[PDB]
Design an enzyme around this catalytic site. Structure first.
Site, mmCIF file in Angstrom:
data_model
loop_
_atom_site.group_PDB
_atom_site.id
_atom_site.type_symbol
_atom_site.label_atom_id
_atom_site.label_comp_id
_atom_site.label_asym_id
_atom_site.label_seq_id
_atom_site.Cartn_x
_atom_site.Cartn_y
_atom_site.Cartn_z
ATOM 1 N N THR A 291 0.720 -0.973 0.191
ATOM 2 C CA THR A 291 0.205 -0.017 -0.075
ATOM 3 C C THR A 291 0.506 1.196 0.233
ATOM 4 O O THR A 291 0.202 2.009 -0.645
ATOM 5 C CB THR A 291 -0.735 -0.070 0.986
ATOM 6 O OG1 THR A 291 -0.220 -0.152 2.354
ATOM 7 C CG2 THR A 291 -1.704 -1.111 0.744
ATOM 8 N N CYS A 292 2.253 1.347 0.920
ATOM 9 C CA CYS A 292 2.784 2.350 0.687
ATOM 10 C C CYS A 292 3.574 2.950 -0.102
ATOM 11 O O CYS A 292 3.848 3.729 -0.568
ATOM 12 C CB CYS A 292 4.532 2.288 1.687
ATOM 13 S SG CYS A 292 3.340 1.205 3.260
#
Ligand SMILES: CNCCCN1c2ccccc2CCc2ccc(Cl)cc21
EC number: 2.3.2.26
Length: 375
Positions: free
Chosen positions: A348-349
């Site tokens: 997700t980062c």
């Protein structure tokens, strides 16, 4: 004028904080009975304004949890219950749709249905007020009624295409010789239910002089007439949290995105602003299958895939060209990772999908879908 993001900022600026309220709203609930416990608490408050305080929710006596996270879980759980067609308040708009509408027969099932709808309105209101999302997608006329916008023939397209096409034919051609009457025939329980659209409707022929009225009455029958009290009760609850005048700065697409986070994802724009890693490319067989899969997912599934990979469901303004990761601008990314045995993983980062090189579309479809429904 203002685009959606500037409207939302403006909106929050006008949504002033209550000071004459306790500093928190405490609500103790049991998961086995979330709906009944929530209903009793939220409809029992001395003042609806109490619901504007910081939500202080506790499940099954579980102390020591972040009240911010618990609230978000509650909005999810209460949505699942409230919008469950099993209770008979809402129903799917068609056999082939996932969008919800108010059930015209909600009252048969539940004598006390108006208070239940007011409750649903209060909770929807609470979601908007506290910046949380409801999990549920309503038909477009639902949002328009909230905004006191007219329901039109066009609204019928998104919900029933066969019907839409018939009324549109009527609008564009002289219908006189078809000898249509001001009635509506509905198929139910293996029978035909006829309803007159106005007094003596059966004996009144649809022509060019009255067809605009005909179409209006058909539309009101399909979306409004039978659910007026229900919607009135929902709006009452909703407006106890969000001033009706404030919600009016949004159109019906903006309102839906605001309340439920759902909208049409431009898969084209998503596709053109995707980057590829470790062997993958736009022409790669697996990638071709990826976009084939996305294209045939429901709007709901497209959203949740986006949610899985990015960490959030929000689609960036001015498209996916301006998507952010954790450390700055980061395009949606697909990297070749792992063997075909495991499911796709998300970073997700970096808004990155780690996608194994599957050896069939259907395998990709199965593996990707499995990964998503955990989030
Ligand atoms: C037979 N009437 C069913 C009422 C639906 N309802 C439920 C559901 C489960 C348990 C209790 C209750 C009664 C309270 C309530 C409150 C709100 C909503 Cl939306 C639905 C319901």
């Amino acid at each position: 004028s203002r685009d959606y993001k500037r409207k939302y900022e403006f909106f929050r600026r006008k949504l002033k904080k209550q000071n004459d309220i306790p500093n928190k709203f405490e609500m103790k609930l049991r998961r086995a009975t979330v709906l009944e416990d929530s209903y009793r608490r939220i409809m029992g408050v001395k003042r609806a304004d109490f619901l504007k305080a910081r939500l202080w929710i506790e499940f099954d006596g579980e102390k020591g949890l972040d009240y911010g996270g618990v609230a978000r879980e509650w909005f999810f759980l209460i949505s699942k219950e409230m919008f469950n067609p099993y209770y008979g308040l809402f129903e799917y708009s068609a056999t082939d749709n996932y969008t919800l509408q108010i059930n015209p027969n909600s009252g048969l099932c539940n004598e006390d249905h108006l208070s239940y709808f007011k409750f649903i309105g209060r909770v929807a209101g609470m979601a908007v007020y506290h910046g949380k999302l409801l999990d549920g997608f309503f038909i477009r006329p639902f949002y328009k009624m909230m905004l006191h916008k007219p329901i039109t023939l066009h609204d019928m397209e998104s919900v029933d295409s066969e019907y839409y096409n018939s009324l549109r034919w009527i609008l564009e051609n002289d219908p006189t010789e078809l000898d249509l009457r001001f009635i509506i025939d509905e198929e139910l329980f293996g029978q035909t239910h006829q309803h007159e659209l106005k007094n003596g409707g059966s004996e009144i022929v649809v022509t060019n002089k009255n067809k605009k009225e005909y179409i209006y009455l058909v539309i009101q029958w399909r979306f409004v007439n039978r659910i007026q009290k229900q919607m009135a009760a929902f709006k009452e609850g909703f407006f106890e949290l969000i001033p009706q005048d404030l919600i009016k700065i949004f159109d019906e697409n903006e309102l839906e995105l605001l309340m439920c986070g759902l909208g049409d994802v431009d898969v084209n724009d998503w596709r053109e602003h995707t980057k590829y890693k470790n062997g993958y490319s736009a022409n790669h067989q697996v990638i071709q299958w990826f976009w084939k899969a996305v294209l045939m997912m429901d709007s709901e599934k497209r959203i949740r895939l986006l949610q899985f990979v990015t960490g959030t469901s929000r689609v960036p303004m001015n498209g996916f060209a301006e998507l952010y990761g954790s450390n700055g601008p980061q395009s949606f990314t697909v990297e070749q990772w792992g063997t075909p045995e495991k499911l796709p993983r998300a970073h997700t980062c970096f808004n990155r999908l780690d996608l194994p090189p599957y050896e069939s579309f259907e395998e990709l479809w199965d593996k990707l879908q499995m990964a998503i429904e955990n989030t």
